[PDB]
Symmetry: C3
Subunit: 120 residues, 3 copies
């Protein structure tokens, strides 16, 4: 469960893990460069959930690496996706191509308990 | 909960997060190269779950990076693992070595709700 | 839910996904190098959960990549964080800077079921 806005996020099928995000305009990424690709996507997630922007296999096989895509529950702005080319030739992304995906997960990073000294 | 087939996936202990995957044959990965390592592993996961192929610390400390390992619930083929060497010397993987692990997670990427305009 | 010890993990807000980890001493990471940054952080998680050490957007935009941060439920030692610089200039981490984050997730990598031959 989430709410979302934007033209650069596609409806997904039920048996996909994530929503596809689409490139806003043509962009070239030469080898070893990093580019920050903007989107107009905004999401709202429920308590103790977070968005994870990660890669699609078709663009990972060309060397596209997404880094830093943890979208906290408190993040209210537009998603920006940090991409580096770790491949061996330039990557050309065309406007409207699917380049990343957004998966919504619950975390359990809350509710600290006392240390069990007998563990192990 | 999952079902799985294949000779390149090991039984795991209960206190590991993931199943180990094993290299099919000896392979060298020179620095800056990417190789796609095939497996004979197939999985079936329940609704709203997905497989994540990710790295083991022992091979990340040598520069092995896995990229693009999201295995949707709809994916019925054999897993292939995309690996790049971001280390500073060649990586030699021997047949039957544990090189990656598969972790099964539930997503919540479904059930869209209306946007809350009062948030924040 | 987890238990944790250490001076290099910060309390978090409820609407963050993860806890921030802090650098132990000043460290330089030249481009293409990998360094293993030690922490004094130890965690205990409940059954079928695991820690994931991953990146913060502010350090991914400079080229800091974290690799191999799956912390099993059986892992009782101090966390060490494997970092590579895939950026285009040196990265300087100062003592006490927030450089990574720890997110606690549940996995479902247990309970094998029979293969459904009719799937698809």
């Amino acid at each position: 469960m989430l709410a979302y806005q934007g033209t650069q996020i596609k409806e997904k099928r039920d048996e996909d893990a994530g929503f596809d995000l689409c490139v806003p305009y043509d962009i070239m990424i030469p080898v070893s460069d990093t580019k920050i690709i903007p989107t107009d996507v905004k999401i709202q997630v429920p308590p103790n959930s977070f968005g994870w922007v990660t890669g699609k296999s078709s663009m990972a096989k060309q060397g596209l690496l997404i880094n830093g895509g943890i979208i906290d529950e408190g993040y209210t702005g537009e998603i920006q996706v940090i991409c580096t080319n770790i491949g061996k030739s330039n990557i050309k992304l065309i406007e409207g191509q699917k380049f990343a995906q957004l998966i919504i997960l619950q975390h359990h990073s809350n509710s600290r308990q006392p240390w069990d000294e007998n563990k192990i």
